[PDB]
Design an enzyme around this catalytic site. Structure first.
Site, PDB file in Angstrom:
ATOM      1  N   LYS A 184      33.627 -32.286  16.787  1.00 17.57           N
ATOM      2  CA  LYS A 184      35.578 -32.445  16.620  1.00 17.57           C
ATOM      3  C   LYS A 184      36.408 -31.126  15.811  1.00 17.57           C
ATOM      4  O   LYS A 184      35.395 -31.190  14.787  1.00 17.57           O
ATOM      5  CB  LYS A 184      35.805 -33.657  17.455  1.00 17.57           C
ATOM      6  CG  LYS A 184      35.775 -34.595  17.238  1.00 17.57           C
ATOM      7  CD  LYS A 184      34.892 -35.335  16.941  1.00 17.57           C
ATOM      8  CE  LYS A 184      35.230 -36.845  17.191  1.00 17.57           C
ATOM      9  NZ  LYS A 184      35.758 -36.952  19.041  1.00 17.57           N
ATOM     10  N   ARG A 185      37.684 -30.877  15.760  1.00 18.10           N
ATOM     11  CA  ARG A 185      37.792 -30.594  14.453  1.00 18.10           C
ATOM     12  C   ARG A 185      37.446 -31.377  13.131  1.00 18.10           C
ATOM     13  O   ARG A 185      36.661 -32.812  13.960  1.00 18.10           O
ATOM     14  CB  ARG A 185      39.390 -30.215  14.598  1.00 18.10           C
ATOM     15  CG  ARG A 185      40.110 -31.311  14.322  1.00 18.10           C
ATOM     16  CD  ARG A 185      41.453 -31.410  15.394  1.00 18.10           C
ATOM     17  NE  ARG A 185      42.622 -32.432  14.744  1.00 18.10           N
ATOM     18  CZ  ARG A 185      43.856 -32.138  15.149  1.00 18.10           C
ATOM     19  NH1 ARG A 185      44.349 -32.135  16.032  1.00 18.10           N
ATOM     20  NH2 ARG A 185      44.259 -33.425  14.664  1.00 18.10           N
ATOM     21  N   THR A 193      38.832 -35.885  24.321  1.00 14.61           N
ATOM     22  CA  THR A 193      38.647 -35.420  25.576  1.00 14.61           C
ATOM     23  C   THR A 193      36.661 -34.995  25.884  1.00 14.61           C
ATOM     24  O   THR A 193      36.493 -35.256  26.736  1.00 14.61           O
ATOM     25  CB  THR A 193      38.610 -34.628  25.760  1.00 14.61           C
ATOM     26  OG1 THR A 193      38.780 -33.673  25.061  1.00 14.61           O
ATOM     27  CG2 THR A 193      40.864 -34.418  26.297  1.00 14.61           C
ATOM     28  N   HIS A 234      50.825 -34.676  22.309  1.00 11.30           N
ATOM     29  CA  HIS A 234      49.892 -34.762  22.316  1.00 11.30           C
ATOM     30  C   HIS A 234      49.015 -35.575  21.000  1.00 11.30           C
ATOM     31  O   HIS A 234      47.441 -35.795  20.975  1.00 11.30           O
ATOM     32  CB  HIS A 234      48.873 -33.573  22.533  1.00 11.30           C
ATOM     33  CG  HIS A 234      49.255 -33.058  23.633  1.00 11.30           C
ATOM     34  ND1 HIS A 234      48.684 -33.127  24.608  1.00 11.30           N
ATOM     35  CD2 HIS A 234      50.357 -32.277  24.077  1.00 11.30           C
ATOM     36  CE1 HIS A 234      48.743 -31.834  25.785  1.00 11.30           C
ATOM     37  NE2 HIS A 234      49.741 -31.743  25.746  1.00 11.30           N
ATOM     38  N   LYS A 247      33.635 -35.625  27.768  1.00  9.94           N
ATOM     39  CA  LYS A 247      32.583 -34.819  28.560  1.00  9.94           C
ATOM     40  C   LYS A 247      31.015 -35.451  28.094  1.00  9.94           C
ATOM     41  O   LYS A 247      30.791 -35.555  29.240  1.00  9.94           O
ATOM     42  CB  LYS A 247      32.675 -33.609  27.456  1.00  9.94           C
ATOM     43  CG  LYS A 247      34.115 -32.712  27.779  1.00  9.94           C
ATOM     44  CD  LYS A 247      34.583 -32.103  26.440  1.00  9.94           C
ATOM     45  CE  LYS A 247      35.709 -31.432  27.037  1.00  9.94           C
ATOM     46  NZ  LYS A 247      35.812 -30.349  25.463  1.00  9.94           N
ATOM     47  N   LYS A 298      39.825 -38.260  12.130  1.00 13.03           N
ATOM     48  CA  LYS A 298      38.471 -38.296  12.710  1.00 13.03           C
ATOM     49  C   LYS A 298      37.044 -39.261  12.320  1.00 13.03           C
ATOM     50  O   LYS A 298      35.962 -39.209  13.215  1.00 13.03           O
ATOM     51  CB  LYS A 298      38.048 -37.209  13.194  1.00 13.03           C
ATOM     52  CG  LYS A 298      39.221 -36.457  14.397  1.00 13.03           C
ATOM     53  CD  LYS A 298      39.425 -34.936  15.282  1.00 13.03           C
ATOM     54  CE  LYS A 298      40.143 -34.567  15.492  1.00 13.03           C
ATOM     55  NZ  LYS A 298      39.517 -35.227  17.316  1.00 13.03           N
TER      56      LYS A 298
END
Ligand SMILES: OC[C@H]1NC[C@@H](O)[C@@H]1O
Ligand SMILES: OC[C@H]1NC[C@@H](O)[C@@H]1O
Lengths: 804, 804
Positions: A536-537, A644, A345, A648, A542
């Site tokens: 997101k986290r 993901t 993942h 969305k 990120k």
């Protein structure tokens, strides 16, 4: 009210009302006098559950008859969100319930908001598994989600003076009406002990027995009357376990299913992992015997391993087939390889589990023996394929030397599985070229791709009914289980009535979310500004920090030329940091600190707002994504395996600013690059930079605007009472940035101006939006699951109903 | 089938069947294929529960309207047994359910046997409270039982090679369908902290907060449609309580409601006691405010304190009224005294709680201050009533000096209550003459008696339907709620058809129980022997040892003259020993050791059997008592405060061998001494012996038969492989017998011969039986509760229905 929710007939509504009263009366033990809104929520939840269980019984009944190949999806994370509305939509009960609760003096939407999010996952991996369960049921697969019933989920996040506070998630305080405890199917799980050898093979003995209690949650397909099972394991101490102390210490075993880990190499972690694996495998074997001959096992069982977390399923399956069922090694191994498959993942080095040998020795002695023996036979396969290549032998070994001896669990996963997949094309390519190159060269046929997806049920019909209605008006309802049909919206990009409708839905969603911010969090935002959202986290890869640098640039530009026009913006950032991840916790504080200065600068006015979204979770995602204009997907190329959230946003009317990373590449490929705001280094450019060496100083030297920001941070501009508060951030950016924030800064700012330019022309923005929504079909989890089914598990998906 | 169970009509049976199917289908999530007998038990239990809750809602609705004086019964023990049959009988559903389950291919009696005993009590005190709840509901009192929901009850007792093994009671493993969790009514309970003084009174601060979660169990009256509440407190940690460790340590607070204590001065004990008291008082106050003015509090609230266990209710009530509600001391005190009453359940010195000051200081600092201040004002009352009597001052003090400083909790109970009662006439006399003489002389008006009772519902109609039917045939059903009506059976002592019927019921009950012993415990007993039974907790004051001495005498007599006729006997002894009570554990072993020798002696044959009854509990009591011929009630005079087993036996067709102790005196007074086998020392004789000094040697010297038994024990006759195993028993009997076993031996053996003589003449036995059953009316808990209501609480009992 709308067409996408069902019929509100005569017999259904009348029948729902008396079942509501029955549960309030008999189940809840309340009357109208003492009944709070929560009791009303429970009475409805129980009433809707009645229609699930009828279909649930028939489904498992059905699978007993047909005896199909069974899929087992193993994850330590199931990020389910709320269940009530999802349940109403999939059963076509939404209008009947709305009319039914109305006739009782109740608002259903008010009731929905009382349901807590199932605290059962962390992020992408966990939500992915949720979407998959939904898709698997929708496509008629006899599938089972297996994992842990964490008593306390991932923490709830509170902000106190800009800092993340963690508080326990007591999502079960009032009970969970969706789950069914199954104490009668409890199962022993063994720990420690020793291995004895006998004329008759090895024996695992003197083991601590922890008991594993299963809770079952129904998983409804979309309008097909299929209802699958998600089975979650709870730890419960045995009965023969002074006298008072023996009873109190029963708590020790029950600590296994107590908390989800927010890879930290603790014993309790390993125990959780073995716990879910051991009980799950016993259940799988038991179910297969109600079909002796384990040759057919691979035709009746598929097990999907998600990251290295359930890796012990491989030695555990071997242990059962060899030690208990008395099969020969080679035959047991053939069965194990054909049964198991492995999904990776993320390539993050700090998430590929590597356990110390001294720990497996103590906790699971037979498993270590089996691993050593697996490793040996695997290494002879390598030796014979590449004669003399000794470095390959040590690179590929399941056993690592140096300091402490470790078992590489990913290497185990590859050796004992018939398929290995990444989760977006670029990511699966990366696995083949870099971290699993050796394994790829040995077995090129194992390696596949399965680009991640989201479910159109939760992520469109449920969270964005407005958009869902205007699509259905033009092209009907078939797209909900066949999202590729959105292509037909291409013939509407020039239609004037459609352009207006897309834009109106967006503004309704924005107004709505603007009003939610004020009621529940008393913070005041301009609804005609560009809704710029990164959710997101919190993690350095990120690059929330890159977003932060842009927000300060815009602010500095406004201060320099205050009377010059800028497209107004609301910048929203939300996400949880891992409790011991110091840098991530500092970033959160940085974001709120920017908000303090910017939201209170009179010269700025309502032209720039910086809002931190507290306690980001599935149900907040359902509110914010429909309201968004700009999707921030800005990870350094090669770091985000797929993402993901991005899908969305695409599906909900936001344009995307992003790097060519993970699924962004495929999203841009589907909508065309012109309809996408791509910026920054590709993967090749990051590599070239890594070779020469990354020098952040150089960017600070050539870009004056960047220099100013660094000075501001250092000198206490955003922290007046604690001047040197952000010294770690500056110091990381300058000397130890693994994710090269400064290197993407210029092109990110340049891209952002183009986003702004296009937003001044509402008509062109919205046409570009239509082109995104129309091409998001590939990103349905129905498509993903169909691919797993055909290329990995060997079962045919089905769209056929089961009798009502 | 029979008249005492209700009508099995047309609409009820049909309607019960579809609710059975509804719960099996929807509640349990099972079908006929996977449904085990346990699921069938749960489906019935849920179906019957539906009829309870309807009446439950209306009852609490009713009390809200009428606003009657509320009774609060506080006990750390609620020994409820099984609930299903009790529920069916009180609602008149038994025949409808039996017919209904029959039509479904189910045996109801088989289903009843799957229900676990509620592990919520230990013995007499706990069963007493159960009978009382039943009686209170039957008599229409707005009453509430309050206590702790122990997660694990009193241990289950297993015998292994003659020894008691303790094992946890996981009575909740499969769930409890009778209870309703009420998370919405959770309450803070405080510990440790410190006291601060302000211009505005004292404040309790820096406290650990444990949360108290209530579970509600319905308590149905007998056919009056009244359903009261039993509320039980569970411990649950607060929400703001590394990160993983904070979540795991939440177990520490939850250990309060984890285990019932089998008086042991542990902290956890004190915490349990404060825990139940604190939450209960908050609930009581809350309920009263929904009627400002605490003058009316005593007219709206009655609190009954059972032994010193909830004693802290007194300082706690003071603490709330003074510190929180701001009432003046004198007024708060007037309210506390009028609200509270105190029942003493036993004079055993080792059960009158005396806590160390250093412990109350730490755990509850404000409570200690309040106690000191209570003690001070109480001692001025003593000083002024008895001027110069300084020894009285120290005898009566709530504070004891010497070694460690202690608080006498019984003294507290007397000072802060308006009534103090013992539990049988002789016991209440003893309190007045000995241990509370000083308090009696100061306030003669506080002291009352309330002879204990049992409920005729469980203890006749439920456990002995056969006997219940033959009584009803002659005199109808009115006796079930008015047990005094059994007097009318006096006119039947000479009726030939009745004599035969009583004797037949007894033999049916015996045959039945004989067959239960074989199936579940493979042990073979002669059903025409005299069923000699002693069932209660194992303790030296209860003198199981005296019974043991008789069993060995009979055995020795049989061996001496083997061909001489003796009335055959089955001697049954059952009871749990407290885990750390060494002597009691040895006695159990002695009993099973006698069984080994006696049950395997060919010369004895089926003339004497010694059986130890394993895991004595409420549901085993329901089986054995109906089957008994001889009730052993043989405690040393002055030690058994009342007993209640004795009343169970009287009511069920057993004759009684007993000392003039506790309620035996009143049982003999009611049936006439001629109809009773009274033997041994009275209280006066024990006193005289205590004065001269007890010398067991003397009895060993004059009674040869006794000498032989002692030699047998010493020399290993009953322990061949471990000759000196019973050395502690012999040594205690000889030098340190506090309960004077040897002193009652001769007259006990003599009395036993008379029991045997009378049994050879079945007709006379049975006539004597009739005279006992006919006079057992006084021992109904309906009578007891009616007396508490009128003389203590000041509420009028009622026999009136509530609408169906
Ligand atoms: O595969 C689940 C998630 N792992 C990391 C993300 O890139 C991906 O969506
Ligand atoms: O009052 C309850 C019990 N305490 C000791 C026994 O004598 C009595 O029945």
């Amino acid at each position: 009210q709308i067409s996408v929710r069902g019929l509100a007939g005569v017999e259904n509504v009348t029948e729902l009302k008396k079942n509501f009263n029955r549960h309030l009366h008999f189940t809840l033990v309340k009357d109208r006098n003492v009944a709070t809104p929560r009791d009303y929520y429970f009475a409805l939840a129980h009433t809707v559950r009645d229609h699930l269980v009828g279909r649930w019984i028939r489904t498992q009944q059905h699978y007993y008859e047909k005896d199909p190949k069974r899929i087992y999806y193993l994850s330590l994370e199931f990020y389910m969100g709320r269940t009530l509305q999802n349940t109403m939509v999939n059963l076509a009960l939404e209008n009947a319930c709305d009319e039914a609760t109305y006739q009782l003096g109740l608002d259903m939407e008010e009731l929905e908001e009382i349901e807590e999010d199932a605290g059962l996952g962390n992020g992408g991996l966990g939500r992915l598994a949720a979407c998959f369960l939904d898709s698997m049921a929708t496509l008629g697969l006899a599938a089972y989600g297996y994992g842990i019933r964490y008593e306390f989920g991932i923490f709830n996040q509170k902000i106190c003076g800009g800092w993340q506070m963690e508080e326990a998630d007591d999502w079960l305080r009032y009970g969970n009406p969706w789950e069914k405890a199954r104490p009668e199917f409890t199962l022993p799980v063994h720990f420690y002990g020793r291995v004895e050898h006998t004329s008759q093979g090895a024996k695992w003995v003197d083991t601590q027995v922890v008991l594993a209690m299963p809770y079952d949650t129904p998983v409804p397909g979309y309008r097909n009357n299929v209802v699958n099972t998600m089975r979650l394991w709870s730890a419960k101490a045995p009965n023969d376990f002074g006298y008072i102390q023996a009873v109190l210490d029963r708590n020790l075993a029950e600590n296994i299913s107590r908390v989800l880990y927010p890879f930290e190499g603790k014993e309790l972690r390993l125990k959780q992992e073995y716990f879910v694996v051991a009980a799950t495998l016993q259940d799988i074997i038991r179910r297969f015997k109600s079909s002796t001959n384990f040759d057919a096992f691979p035709d009746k069982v598929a097990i999907q391993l998600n990251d290295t977390h359930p890796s012990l399923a491989i030695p555990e399956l071997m242990r059962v087939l060899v030690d208990l069922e008395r099969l020969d090694w080679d035959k047991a191994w053939e069965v194990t390889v054909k049964t198991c498959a492995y999904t990776n993942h993320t390539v993050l080095p700090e998430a590929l589990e590597r356990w110390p040998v001294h720990l497996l020795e103590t906790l699971l002695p037979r498993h270590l023996q089996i691993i050593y023996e697996i490793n040996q036979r695997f290494l002879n396969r390598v030796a014979a394929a590449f004669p003399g290549d000794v470095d390959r032998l040590r690179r590929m070994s399941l056993v690592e030397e140096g300091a402490v001896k470790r078992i590489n669990m990913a290497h185990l996963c590859i050796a004992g599985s018939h398929a290995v997949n990444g989760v977006a094309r670029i990511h699966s390519e990366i696995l083949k070229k870099t971290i699993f190159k050796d394994f790829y060269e040995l077995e090129p046929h194992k390696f596949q791709n399965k680009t991640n997806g989201i479910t159109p049920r939760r992520w469109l019909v449920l969270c964005n009914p407005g958009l869902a209605e205007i699509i259905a008006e033009r092209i009907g309802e078939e797209y909900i289980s066949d999202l590729d049909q959105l292509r037909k919206l291409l013939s509407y990009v020039d239609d004037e009535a459609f352009i207006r409708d897309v834009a109106k839905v967006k503004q309704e969603n924005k107004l709505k979310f603007a009003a939610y911010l004020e009621r529940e969090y008393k913070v005041h935002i301009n609804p005609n500004s560009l809704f710029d959202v990164q959710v997101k986290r919190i993690h350095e890869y990120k690059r929330q920090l890159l977003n932060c640098l842009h927000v300060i640039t815009l602010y500095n530009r406004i201060k320099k030329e205050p009377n010059k026009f800028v497209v107004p913006r609301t910048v929203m950032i939300g996400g949880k940091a891992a409790p011991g991840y110091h840098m991530a916790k500092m970033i959160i504080k940085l974001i709120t600190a920017i908000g303090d200065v910017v939201n209170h600068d009179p010269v700025v006015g309502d032209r720039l707002r910086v809002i931190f979204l507290e306690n980001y979770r599935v149900s907040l995602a359902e509110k914010v994504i429909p309201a968004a204009d700009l999707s921030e997907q800005i990870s350094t190329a090669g770091t985000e395996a797929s993402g993901t959230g991005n899908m969305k946003f695409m599906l909900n009317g936001a344009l995307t600013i992003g790097t060519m990373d993970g699924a962004n590449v495929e999203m841009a490929e589907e909508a065309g690059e012109e309809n996408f705001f791509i910026f920054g280094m590709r993967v090749e450019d990051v590599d070239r930079l890594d070779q020469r060496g990354y020098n952040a100083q150089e960017y600070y030297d050539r870009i004056p605007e960047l220099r100013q920001i660094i000075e501001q941070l250092s000198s206490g501009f955003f922290s007046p009472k604690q001047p040197d508060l952000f010294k770690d951030i500056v110091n990381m950016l300058m000397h130890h940035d693994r994710f090269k924030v400064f290197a993407d800064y210029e092109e990110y700012v340049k891209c952002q101006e183009r986003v702004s330019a296009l937003y001044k022309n509402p008509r062109e923005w919205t046409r570009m939006v239509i082109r995104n929504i129309a091409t998001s079909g590939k990103f349905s989890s129905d498509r993903t699951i169909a691919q797993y089914a055909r290329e990995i598990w060997g079962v045919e998906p089905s769209r056929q109903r089961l009798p009502a």
